[PDB]
Design a protein around this ligand. Structure first.
Ligand SMILES: Cc1cc2nc3c(=O)[nH]c(=O)nc-3n(C[C@H](O)[C@H](O)[C@H](O)COP(=O)(O)OP(=O)(O)OC[C@H]3O[C@@H](n4cnc5c(N)ncnc54)[C@H](O)[C@@H]3O)c2cc1C
Ligand SMILES: Cc1cc2nc3c(=O)[nH]c(=O)nc-3n(C[C@H](O)[C@H](O)[C@H](O)COP(=O)(O)OP(=O)(O)OC[C@H]3O[C@@H](n4cnc5c(N)ncnc54)[C@H](O)[C@@H]3O)c2cc1C
Lengths: 458, 458
């Protein structure tokens, strides 16, 4: 419990909504996407403006509260809710200003991808982000951020030009290439370690309809499909994006009844460019195996962003183990095929992603984001509903990771699970981590922002 | 020019951004979706909160300025921008709160539909709205609001539980079925006539994946297709929505190149319900003619919302003529088909829509929205780029409306064009218009809010 004078000064200065443990909406407001994370904050501060974040940050500093920051709540490590502290909740700060003439967007730190993509696509514009519309822009960008447009236009952070950020001392800074560039380097891949970003400014690109295809392959054909994918993507043009999701076949009308609920490869591909060139490019990779339940469409980019994933049935409980690879050996391929065959939940996916492209043409040290040179990402994304089944699904993710871990290097900070705080050094590597620690010593010396993949100062 | 003490009082109490005619942003901020409307306001006030709106409304009243209110800026009459007045611009108020347990959404009056649907679909919830993601929620709901979910769940206003509204005198009111119910009746169909809605509260429904189909028919088979559409829809279950859009075929790879740029019927259909039943219901309506470029998919609802329209081009200039039909005779069908063959712009649509269903089962006098018992809507929506071609496109819409005038009645206020201020009485009918005038006499007696399909007080 808190100082009255400190709390009263906070309440007068705070324009947003405060949510106490006794309030009706406390239980829904403290839930985040990873439902296995059950925590009880002392206070949830729903900010509506940059002055609100300044007041909440100062309040937390003086009062000694543990600080959780929440954008869209999608932390796979559960960092956006704390026990006994304050949640600086940005979900009500989701305004977007788009300039069609300048090809610029200014978005508040609480935006969801779908709101952002709606605003830019009102002008046939877009900039890279993740593939699920209700992910938060805040956490996604600060870790790097990749999706459909990334092989063509880079990570989200490769299109970011400045941020407004509230630092631990309550001061509001602007960071960019011309102002506080040490800070600007660190927020592009260093997470929420350095303060609360209340505004992101992006460069946008013209993105009209995209030819898109999704289809399913029998695991019978697993070896030939994954090897075709790995070989083709090594030399594919930047305009082609092709991703593999190993999962149980959803009970959908386009799929034969005898495939429902059985392990399959779900392959999703799109061409960022001319749709007629796209139709020719996709037809030539869709028949690596016999395609079942093939869906082909020419979609507005916003509808591509909203498509993922097939089945659309939001899971309650999640556990992820992820890593990068430099190559995908035959030994690795048979390992992922064997564990795909043991998937138990219809909501679990073993994701095989290929980045590279424009992501890999940015020099390594240009941003805080690591592993630009590793084009492969594997993600064992277990998801389920029943809390008494946690061990079964968590064990699938862990045993698959361990069987693969020798082939893996690094790790995407935004795919880390609640027990992977120790993976931070191996994620960034030694030189980036050390540079990150020096920025942290300058801007967050007391480590006030430690619910993240944390970088201790000095 | 403005009295400097009133202006300083406004600027102190206003926590948003003011955009003056001398500012660099002025020309982009005063543009609205309908590019034929070129107006220069004295001031654009970008509000960030309900108190911002209160200050702007009170500043406009005291200064005698003409008030334009802007949500998403999609007014087909150009009402969201004014010459010499103030634009009360809500585009930055786009925050949404969703309660999964209570199945409820609270959205600010500046929201765009895509932002709304992203927030609700994070919980697999939805409530009816329009078919294009970057339409503003504010104007659409105040005029009624229909789209994919409407035959099943009604108009947007049929799911509205309450509003927070800033009236002409500067007061903030709540309106619901138990609090100011005369105002709550009028805002549900009466447009912006009664004040600035800063928050809408909605009931939500669970909407998982939906089977969807879009395809194209030659006008050669046009009489067979339209007759099958009007016959089938008279007795179709609520779960089926089927819409026809007569247009030039977009140059998409799913269509044979010899159809590109020639008039066709674009037919879009969905089943709000089980996708397997949806696949059977859709297949039963897809073959009244030979379907070309057939796209079939099982989509998350948010992706269905983001799909329209094929080609994903934003036109700069628009002109619309719309009315309702109680029946669609064979003679009207021939008139529609002949007029469609004359379409010149690739962005023009002659839309044939069928509402009915849940829309028609709400008692006529339960809301201010008129014509619930007319199932058909036709919208001659001309759209183009070149400002030297205005006359030809505008004349296409007017001549088609005049050729159909024997079959048309009423009119949707949200489809009115800039020259249709006179149609307000015919749209609502005498009895509804008179009662609307009595509510207006009470809440906006000076007709402060007149940039809308206007209802004079008394
Ligand atoms: C279903 C799903 C799909 C995903 N798809 C992708 C994908 O396609 N591509 C991809 O790259 N990632 C993807 N992700 C991962 C995503 O990038 C991370 O989970 C990210 O951290 C989520 O951001 P958030 O704001 O929603 O999360 P939150 O839980 O709100 O926050 C995440 C972290 O960032 C911090 N943070 C958030 N907002 C701010 C802010 N404004 N200022 C400072 N710190 C902040 C929080 O303190 C926390 O440490 C996906 C995740 C999920 C669950
Ligand atoms: C491409 C396109 C697709 C469309 N599709 C559909 C569809 O599927 N279904 C449908 O029913 N309609 C549809 N519409 C029409 C739409 O309902 C109207 O154009 C609506 O008025 C647009 O709302 P807005 O806030 O974007 O418009 P604006 O131009 O910002 O405002 C329109 C009117 O509403 C008033 N207003 C707006 N917000 C508020 C508020 N918060 N409080 C008070 N008054 C307010 C304004 O003063 C003005 O009179 C479509 C329009 C377009 C251009």
């Amino acid at each position: 419990q808190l100082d009255p004078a400190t709390l009263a000064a906070f309440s007068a200065a705070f324009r947003g909504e405060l949510i106490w443990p006794s309030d009706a909406d406390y239980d829904e407001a403290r839930r985040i996407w990873n439902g296995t994370i059950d925590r009880r904050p002392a206070l949830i501060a729903r900010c509506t403006s940059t002055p609100d974040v300044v007041a909440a940050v100062s309040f937390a500093r003086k009062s000694g509260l543990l600080v959780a920051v929440r954008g869209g709540g999608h932390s796979m490590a559960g960092h956006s809710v704390c026990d006994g502290g304050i949640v600086i909740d940005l979900s009500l700060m989701n305004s977007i200003k788009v300039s069609r003439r300048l090809r610029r967007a200014r978005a508040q730190g609480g935006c969801l991808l779908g709101a952002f993509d709606t605003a830019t696509q009102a002008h046939m514009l877009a900039t890279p982000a993740g593939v699920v519309s209700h992910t938060g822009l805040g956490g996604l960008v600060l870790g790097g951020g990749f999706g459909w447009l990334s092989r063509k236009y880079g990570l989200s952070i490769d299109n970011l030009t400045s941020v407004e950020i509230v630092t631990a001392d309550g001061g509001v800074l602007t960071a960019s290439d011309t102002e506080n560039p040490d800070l600007f380097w660190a927020v592009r891949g260093g997470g929420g370690n350095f303060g609360v970003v209340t505004a992101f400014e992006f460069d946008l690109h013209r993105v009209g309809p995209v030819r898109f295809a999704s289809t399913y392959y029998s695991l019978d054909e697993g070896p030939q499909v994954i090897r075709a994918w790995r070989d083709h993507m090594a030399t594919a043009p930047d305009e082609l994006t092709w991703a593999l999701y190993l999962r149980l076949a959803p009970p959908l009308p386009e799929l034969p009844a005898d495939m429902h609920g059985k392990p399959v490869i779900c392959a999703m591909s799109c061409w960022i460019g001319d749709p007629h060139e796209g139709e020719r490019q996709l037809e030539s990779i869709l028949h690596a195996g016999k395609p079942h339940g093939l869906t082909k469409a020419t979609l507005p980019y916003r509808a591509l962003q909203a498509y993922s994933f097939p089945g659309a049935v939001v899971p309650d409980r999640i556990y992820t183990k992820s890593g990068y690879l430099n190559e995908l050996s035959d030994e690795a391929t048979d390992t992922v095929l064997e564990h795909a065959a043991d998937i138990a939940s219809p909501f679990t996916q073993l994701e095989l992603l290929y980045l590279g492209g424009a992501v890999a043409r940015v020099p390594d040290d240009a941003t805080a984001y690591p592993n630009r040179q590793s084009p492969f990402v594997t993600n064992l994304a277990a998801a389920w509903m029943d809390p008494t089944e946690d061990a079964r699904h968590t064990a699938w993710a862990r045993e698959g990771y361990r069987a693969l871990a020798g082939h893996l290097s690094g790790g995407y900070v935004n795919f880390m699970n609640p027990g992977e705080a120790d993976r931070t050094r191996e994620a960034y590597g030694a030189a980036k981590f050390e540079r990150l620690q020096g920025v942290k010593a300058k801007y967050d010396p007391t480590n006030l922002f430690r619910l993240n993949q944390n970088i201790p100062p000095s």
